Design a protein around this ligand. Structure first.
Ligand SMILES: CC(C)(COP(=O)(O)OP(=O)(O)OC[C@H]1O[C@@H](n2cnc3c(N)ncnc32)[C@H](O)[C@@H]1OP(=O)(O)O)[C@@H](O)C(=O)NCCC(=O)NCCS
Ligand SMILES: CC(C)(COP(=O)(O)OP(=O)(O)OC[C@H]1O[C@@H](n2cnc3c(N)ncnc32)[C@H](O)[C@@H]1OP(=O)(O)O)[C@@H](O)C(=O)NCCC(=O)NCCS
Lengths: 430, 430
């Protein structure tokens, strides 16, 4: 049975309202220069990932490419990103020799789990004998529409017919609804979720790539003592359970990873114990029913299933993990993810957050670079970013947020929609 | 090399304007009952495919599900079809036990090649040890908007920034443009393409599933001697090279296949020589550059690469083929596909069409049930429908268009966008 290695990757800056890199009315270059397009982001990410993986000048030995994207077709009027990817190496240089021509490529989609799904596709290709080296890249541009139109586009991840009517901000409302049930059962509090945000923003502050790098927020501000942290939903039933700072960012960006099997390492002139590597011990996907929600909003069943398949295939337990990256699309999700991954027991996510166990100096750091809340959330990119963040901590590459104890085992947990798709991976430092 | 087998599948009726199954002003149930939604089609297809494959009552032994869909997010406001698929077995029966819960599922996309890509993904899962039995379904609902608004959505398959401006009907125009170059080089004529249409429609007439089943068209009518067969593009440069009858249909529908490896056949209680099977000897994907077109419109380079990889991996030649399905999204495409597949030499597709070699009684029948022109073209479903049509002819299941000499070998050629993605498979009767 065939091994699988992360050889290298790349995460772009994540940009949107609030970032100094984002060009808006207030920006020095407003009207003069533009933010990157989807094509441009995809080009930077494909090229960044080749460069950092040592493939510049021999990109022809990549056997195939998988692109994770959720809503390109709506935000940029652009689907069919497979051939977009094939043309990304030499983007804007007409006629140039393209070593990726004619190779297999596709886009895969499962809402915010698209990146994660791109990695599983790539890993199947590696273990099937159809590929020895594969490129998995995920990208998204969301800043081309308003929060309201964007919210309707993101509603595509829900059972639209059934759930769109909840609120224009369908997804924030779906997690408000969970928080209502969570409050009524005393599973954890809105104080606890403010503590998650405080952690994310503190981590972001140490991360120049993070969308919210330049924004500082105290616990008290996250807890709603700022009037600018408004409860913005229209739905009266759930309005009171969600503040702006509980929400992940509308961001643009990309992340890419190059994966290889043993034959691929050989082709690259590398040995299986080269210290630039990380092994993906296991990866697993679990998907539930779009059309039916379970009663217990305090449990992410689908994510827990994926985390358990992966930890089991890796033959380790949650306590053996040294770092993790999880799908904090809201502060509410991060709490739920601690329990889905298994690093806290059902009902004990609050213990972990109250004791700082998941902070950089805690015993099981999570979302070290700021997570979706601060790093940001260009949806298609997230699942691959998660993989690369564990990589980077493992390889000592995280600078201001580098962990002082290099982690030997790490896990990711990537989520599509309202816990309807989940992908989880176990990573082993080499 | 682990072997892969088609165990069974299902093709819905394909429906749209002109079909007696399609509910419009002319339909008895107009105003009273509605056409199937995307969710509904997906349900019918998943259930159909399980039933025909002998999995009713043991759907739990399916390991994974991949969905091919191109534009659900635009036409139906619905992405994230993976979990929609997981909930399709028991669609509309709230609370019911679901044996597909927690299994891996995703959606894959490469324009009109989406179905083909779903098959490749499933096949990788089969050969990777991640699956022994996989379900690949493709679906699409395109009748929820006009042909014009639909044309802009389908533009997502082109380099939208660059090519949308050609015409509201971006794709028809892209193939009109090829036809202009084709005419100038005398590669083949508009007469020849009318002969393709005549063939499609005559085949469709023998196929109750076909969108255009009830419509009859003479060569002369396809050749533009009907004034109702209009040259409908706005673009003055290409207007004259495309008639309505050259175009594939705006259709709704689904197609599904169940694929198994040797371990999967065992699990199902079947032997590798069971005569309900067909082997997929090979499959290949080839993707070119979205952003650059080759000068020679008389050659589908990307499709030809895929066809040659597949025939080669199967260790056969084009002359060994007994039947084929090819991606006739326009009559112009079918001609080009004969040469891409290799059943005609460069410049000789006209020979084949002129002496009826690709008709039901010809020596290499192509698109026996009517192809995209008449059977119809719900884009995501097409790639899998192609596979199933070769299956059905092989298993004697085609009724009024059944071939009198059962074919031993068949090939498919499925295309995304303007020859930017191609998938081709070689099938061996058992
Ligand atoms: C970014 C986000 C917090 C919106 O906030 P924003 O950047 O300030 O943008 P806006 O201020 O335009 O939108 C907030 C809305 O709340 C309401 N609001 C009321 N008072 C407000 C105030 N003082 N400040 C901000 N918004 C206010 C408004 O209706 C406003 O929208 P409008 O412009 O249509 O009136 C939110 O839309 C978001 O991030 N959503 C992401 C959800 C997601 O990605 N889910 C997928 C997970 S897989
Ligand atoms: C051919 C096709 C466009 C026509 O379907 P339709 O609904 O019967 O045709 P419509 O009635 O909408 O007419 C379309 C256009 O024909 C044009 N036209 C010009 N003169 C006309 C006339 N006398 N009568 C009818 N139409 C005429 C019009 O411009 C009209 O659009 P409009 O009403 O917005 O102006 C449709 O089958 C199609 O779009 N096929 C292509 C699918 C595809 O592109 N697939 C590729 C993906 S791999």
């Amino acid at each position: 049975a065939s091994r699988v290695f992360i050889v290298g990757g790349h995460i772009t800056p994540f940009v949107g309202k609030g970032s100094p890199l984002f060009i808006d009315k207030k920006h020095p270059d407003f009207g003069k220069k533009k933010n990157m397009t989807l094509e441009e982001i995809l080009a930077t990410t494909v090229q960044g990932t080749m460069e950092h993986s040592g493939l510049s000048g021999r990109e022809g030995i990549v056997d195939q490419v998988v692109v994770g994207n959720f809503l390109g077709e709506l935000f940029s009027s652009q689907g069919h990103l497979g051939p977009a990817a094939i043309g990304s190496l030499t983007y804007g240089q007409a006629g140039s020799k393209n070593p990726l021509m004619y190779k297999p490529a596709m886009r895969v989609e499962g809402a915010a789990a698209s990146g994660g799904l791109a990695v599983i596709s790539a890993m199947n290709a590696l273990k099937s004998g159809s590929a020895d080296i594969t490129l998995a890249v995920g990208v998204e541009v969301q800043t081309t529409a308003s929060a309201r139109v964007g919210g309707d586009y993101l509603a595509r991840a829900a059972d639209y017919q059934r759930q769109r009517q909840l609120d224009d901000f369908t997804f924030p409302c779906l997690f408000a609804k969970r928080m209502k049930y969570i409050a009524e059962h005393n599973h954890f509090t809105m104080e606890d979720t403010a503590r998650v945000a405080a952690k994310a923003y503190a981590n972001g502050n140490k991360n120049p790539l993070a969308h919210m790098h330049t924004r500082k927020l105290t616990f008290e501000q996250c807890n709603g003592e700022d009037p600018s942290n408004v409860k913005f939903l229209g739905n009266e039933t759930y309005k009171e359970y969600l503040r702006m700072t509980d929400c992940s960012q509308v961001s643009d960006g990309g992340a890419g990873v190059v994966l290889a099997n043993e034959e691929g390492l050989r082709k690259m002139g590398l040995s299986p114990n080269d210290s630039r590597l990380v092994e993906i011990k296991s990866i697993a996907c679990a998907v539930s029913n779009l059309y039916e929600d379970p009663d217990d909003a305090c449990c992410m069943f689908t994510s827990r299933q994926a985390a358990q398949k992966a930890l089991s295939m890796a033959n380790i337990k949650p306590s053996d993990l040294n770092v993790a990256e999880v799908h904090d699309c809201f502060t509410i999700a991060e709490m739920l993810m601690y329990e889905a991954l298994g690093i806290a027991e059902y009902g004990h996510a609050k213990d972990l957050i109250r004791n700082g166990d998941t902070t950089l100096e805690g015993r099981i750091p999570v979302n070290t670079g700021g997570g979706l809340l601060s790093f940001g959330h260009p949806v298609g990119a997230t699942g691959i970013k998660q993989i690369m963040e564990v990589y980077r901590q493992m390889k000592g590459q995280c600078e201001a947020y580098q962990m002082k104890k290099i982690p030997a085992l790490g896990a990711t947990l990537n989520m599509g929609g309202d816990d309807k798709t989940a992908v989880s991976a176990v990573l082993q430092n080499i």
